Amino acid sequence: MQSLNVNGTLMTYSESGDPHAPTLFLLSGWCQDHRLFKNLAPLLARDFHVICPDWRGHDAKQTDSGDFDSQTLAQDLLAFIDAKGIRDFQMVSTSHGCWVNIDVCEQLGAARLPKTIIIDWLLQPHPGFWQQLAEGQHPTEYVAGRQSFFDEWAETTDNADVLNHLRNEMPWFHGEMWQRACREIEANYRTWGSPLDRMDSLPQKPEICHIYSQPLSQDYRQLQLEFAAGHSWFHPRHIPGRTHFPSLENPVAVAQAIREFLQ
């Protein structure tokens, strides 16, 4: 569908809603699509003008070109807002799409965009994770590293749509993307330490709302309640899912949270 191109290449993007309504971007993780938002978008099309873009290399044409930084993906989106002429807007990002989200909050004003949402971004790395990022980049067995996440991300769901996602969306992309993703995610943790440090180091902080079901850790749920008690620009919202994609597993819940935070 609709596909304005930016910077080095293109990204196909979907549009849903009244253009002259509050503009809201739905941004995926690596190796994901606008189809991540398939359940959530038609709901938000009532209130917002809703754009679900497809990252470099993630279009239906899975287009190559140079490898790239998590920082050029930012650049992509900045050449987007401008190219279409959009001064007022918000964004909601998934997983490691958030690194891009926060970059833009940092590149543009806080004044400019005073609020942002992130979904199921792992706020703190752990030994398991670092491994899977390595398994992930293995030229001959990147699949087993891909698969490792899936088993985890999926947990015990019967959820038709989440299952479909991790059988037909994500593993469909090329090994060369699965790998870039790992180098990149890996790179960001090494730079910032964690999403929490990343955020804590913005000079002017938006109100940030983290929607999330996973990791299924009571400690982790407690860690956010606690970060938030110390940092009032932070607003965790736990959806009780078993899955890594609350936008697929629990679209009614996510829509209501986006709705309420964003006004």
UniProtKB/Swiss-Prot annotation:
Active site: H244 (proton donor/acceptor)
Gene3D superfamilies for the chain: 1.10.210.20, alpha/beta hydrolase (3.40.50.1820)
Transmembrane region(s): none
Catalytic activity: 3-hydroxy-1H-quinolin-4-one + O2 = N-formylanthranilate + CO + H(+)
EC number: 1.13.11.47
Keywords, ordered alphabetically: Dioxygenase, Oxidoreductase
Any one GO MF annotation of this record: 3-hydroxy-4-oxoquinoline 2,4-dioxygenase activity
Pfam short name (any one): Abhydrolase_6
InterPro entries: AB_hydrolase_1, AB_hydrolase_fold, AB_hydrolase_sf
Keyword ATP-binding: no
Annotated residues for binding of substrate: W30, C31, Q32, T94, S95, W153
Activity response to pH changes: Optimum pH is 8.
Keyword Oxidoreductase among record annotations: yes
Top enzyme category: oxidoreductase
CC per GO annotation: membrane
Cofactor details (free text): None. Contrary to most other dioxygenases, this enzyme does not require a cofactor for catalysis.
Site (Increases basicity of active site His): D120
Effect on the protein upon substituting S95 to A/C: Reduced affinity for substrate, and strongly reduced enzyme activity
Protein purpose: Ring-cleaving dioxygenase involved in oxoquinoline degradation and utilization.
Annotated family: Belongs to the AB hydrolase superfamily.
Protein name per its UniProtKB record: 1H-3-hydroxy-4-oxoquinoline 2,4-dioxygenase
Gene: qdo
